[PDB]
Amino acid sequence: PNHPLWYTLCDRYGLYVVDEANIETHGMVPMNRLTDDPRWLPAMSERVTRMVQRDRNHPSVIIWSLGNESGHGANHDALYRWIKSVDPSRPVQYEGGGADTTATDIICPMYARVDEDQPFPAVPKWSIKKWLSLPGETRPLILCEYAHAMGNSLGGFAKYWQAFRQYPRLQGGFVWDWVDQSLIKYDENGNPWSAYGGDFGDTPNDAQFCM
Amino acid sequence: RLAVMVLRWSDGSYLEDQDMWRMSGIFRDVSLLHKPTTQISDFHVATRFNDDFSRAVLEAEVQMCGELRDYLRVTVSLWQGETQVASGTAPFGGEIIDERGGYADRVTLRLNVENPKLWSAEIPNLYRAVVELHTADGTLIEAEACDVGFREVRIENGLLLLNGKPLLIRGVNRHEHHPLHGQVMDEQTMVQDILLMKQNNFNAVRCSHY
Numbered sequence A: 001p002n003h004p005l006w007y008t009l010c011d012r013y014g015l016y017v018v019d020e021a022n023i024e025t026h027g028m029v030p031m032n033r034l035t036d037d038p039r040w041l042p043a044m045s046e047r048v049t050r051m052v053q054r055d056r057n058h059p060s061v062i063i064w065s066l067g068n069e070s071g072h073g074a075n076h077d078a079l080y081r082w083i084k085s086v087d088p089s090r091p092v093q094y095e096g097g098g099a100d101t102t103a104t105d106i107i108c109p110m111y112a113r114v115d116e117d118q119p120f121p122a123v124p125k126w127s128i129k130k131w132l133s134l135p136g137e138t139r140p141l142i143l144c145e146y147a148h149a150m151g152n153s154l155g156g157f158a159k160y161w162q163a164f165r166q167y168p169r170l171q172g173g174f175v176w177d178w179v180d181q182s183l184i185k186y187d188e189n190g191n192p193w194s195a196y197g198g199d200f201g202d203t204p205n206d207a208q209f210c211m
Numbered sequence B: 001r002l003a004v005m006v007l008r009w010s011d012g013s014y015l016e017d018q019d020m021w022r023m024s025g026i027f028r029d030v031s032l033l034h035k036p037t038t039q040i041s042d043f044h045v046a047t048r049f050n051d052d053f054s055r056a057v058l059e060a061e062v063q064m065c066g067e068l069r070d071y072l073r074v075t076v077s078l079w080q081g082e083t084q085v086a087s088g089t090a091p092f093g094g095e096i097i098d099e100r101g102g103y104a105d106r107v108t109l110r111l112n113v114e115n116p117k118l119w120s121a122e123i124p125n126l127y128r129a130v131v132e133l134h135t136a137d138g139t140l141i142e143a144e145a146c147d148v149g150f151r152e153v154r155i156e157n158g159l160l161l162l163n164g165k166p167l168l169i170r171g172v173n174r175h176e177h178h179p180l181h182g183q184v185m186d187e188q189t190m191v192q193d194i195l196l197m198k199q200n201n202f203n204a205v206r207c208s209h210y
């Protein structure tokens, strides 16, 4: 959940917002070790419920999100249902565990490609065009993350948009991401320079992957 | 002496505007058939299966015409080569279907078949079904028959399935054409086409358009 003023500004300037619960357990093995543990249900629920109770009156928020990269656990199904129950005015989405689980109203893959499949075991990233027509699938598809803009990037961006315009159920996505997470450091002369992972003695670190 | 006056054009032509040569005449076989007064006028064969196709039920509805009597019976036997795998006998008189009763001139035989050999273009397993119209005491009036292919065709969750598996149709449209005989077909030409089609990895054909 963002700083409260963010939503006010999105309401007045006009931007559709995806409000996301502060829940990410990417480092766990497997990713859903905690989200599938009922003992962590309480802590997770507060991150979802208190978010809804705070931002539900904001018109800019059109979609609720259960969090990010925490695999798919039973706690997600429970909290998914809680929101649908207390607020039927907004769809609920969640990418963990395959981007098309029972915990999301929208197929929201990250970095799924336009025409090329990436058949990862258990959590495949199908080409978005093919994902739509899998036997029994009827939901719309909006990538929660795509076109990773790291450094000299965004090659093939036009391919995504050609597909979005041709396929009704391919309704866009969110580029990853807006601003480089570089920090300012000063040399001996006092001049500023952009720093990233590891420039503060921090280790382990993942270097420039924050930009 | 038979006298057949064939018209090239008729109101029927309005329904025969297929993209092909427009010809006319008696282009297919003409034959003479002899049936007993008490005969098999129609028969349908169906094959249903359990979830894993390890069991099947062959249902054969048989219809008759003529003198309906209590001594009449129908026996449907299923063969695999010279081995009879199944057989059922019964008198006429279908189940009750409405307030007026049922079809007294019909009967439905149901035969159980364990681990049936399934039919497909990959392996065209066939059984032979013989439908015998006879008197209870053993006198055959007449018999009809057909090749039975045990297969289930259904559409599920958006997929066309054959015996439970999704098909990949490698097909071709085929008109009945011969450069010398026109639209008259013969066995050799048919066989040649099929051998050529299968040799070129085709597994399906559409009877375009008749």
Ligand SMILES: O=C1O[C@H](CO)[C@H](O)[C@H](O)[C@H]1O
Residues within 6 Å of the ligand: B018, B019, B208, B209
């Ligand atoms: O649409 C079609 O295309 C073919 C063109 O050769 C042929 O006319 C077929 O009978 C017709 O169905």
Ligand SMILES: [Mg+2]
Residues within 6 Å of the ligand: B017, B018, B019
């Ligand atoms: Mg035509």
Ligand code: NA
Residues within 6 Å of the ligand: A163, A164, A165, A166, A167, A168, A169, A170, A171, A172
């Ligand atoms: Na679209």
Ligand code: NA
Residues within 6 Å of the ligand: A209, A210, A211
């Ligand atoms: Na990153």
